[PDB]
Design a protein around this ligand. Structure first.
Ligand SMILES: [Ba+2]
Ligand SMILES: [Ba+2]
Ligand SMILES: [Ba+2]
Lengths: 81, 81, 81, 81
């Protein structure tokens, strides 16, 4: 069900944002922006992890986030069109 | 229908381009180039939002753009091959 | 047929590489590397178009390249596994 | 079978990491981080190949990695949801 996928993406977003903020020390706004940019796999590289923990964290975010986000946008696609 | 998807991508492009131009202050050419680069999820990071509004705007563009663009290229694929 | 898709990707690669070389003035090696990095939508941003023509060219490359490349890797996936 | 795909992604990861380390001279941590960031097609451009060999290597990594990684995350998606 699409709504459940949405909930998974929301959980991923919180995880991404909190982690970047507390591991890398960026603001909450930058961290959320980075989370979206990373999980949509856009990844501008204006922000990126600079510590070894941040890098490991980024890899797990990638593993949890990218699949979940892809299915969310295409389920949203189906629903609105 | 493929043509309707195309229209959605065109609307997304206009939205992306106008927004980056007026929120971030880049030229129209740069803004359109950034829109394509962002919604195809290529995202070089030569251009990126630098304000909190631009960042929020970028996230919504990502949500509206990436799904629409993916389906457009693959429907175009089917049509030409 | 997978082989025909491969031929399309090869044509896209030549187009991408020649264009970046002659429009942006990078070496042939850099241009090919940029073409792959762009059409796989990896896009590091170590190389990017700096002229208005290069930017327009990049958008058309994106439109022609990304769909073709995606289907090529997944058809290659099927064939080898 | 999903587990076999996982094994392919693990092999790709080792290949990516060892190659970047020995070709480009980055640490093992940076090389692994770059491998994930590249094969998920996130590609921040904080790290990128700077030699002609590294660039050729990156293209082959892209060809081997991106398809394998995409199918792995979506098979993982199915398994956990
Ligand atoms: Ba990217
Ligand atoms: Ba991408
Ligand atoms: Ba990128």
């Amino acid at each position: 069900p699409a709504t459940r996928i949405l909930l998974l993406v929301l959980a991923v977003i919180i995880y991404g944002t909190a982690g970047f903020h507390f591991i890398e020390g960026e603001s909450w706004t930058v961290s959320l922006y980075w989370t979206f940019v990373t999980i949509a796999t856009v990844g501008y590289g204006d922000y990126s992890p600079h510590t070894p923990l941040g890098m490991y964290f980024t890899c797990t975010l990638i593993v949890l986030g990218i699949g979940t986000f892809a299915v969310a946008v295409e389920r949203l696609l189906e629903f609105l069109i």
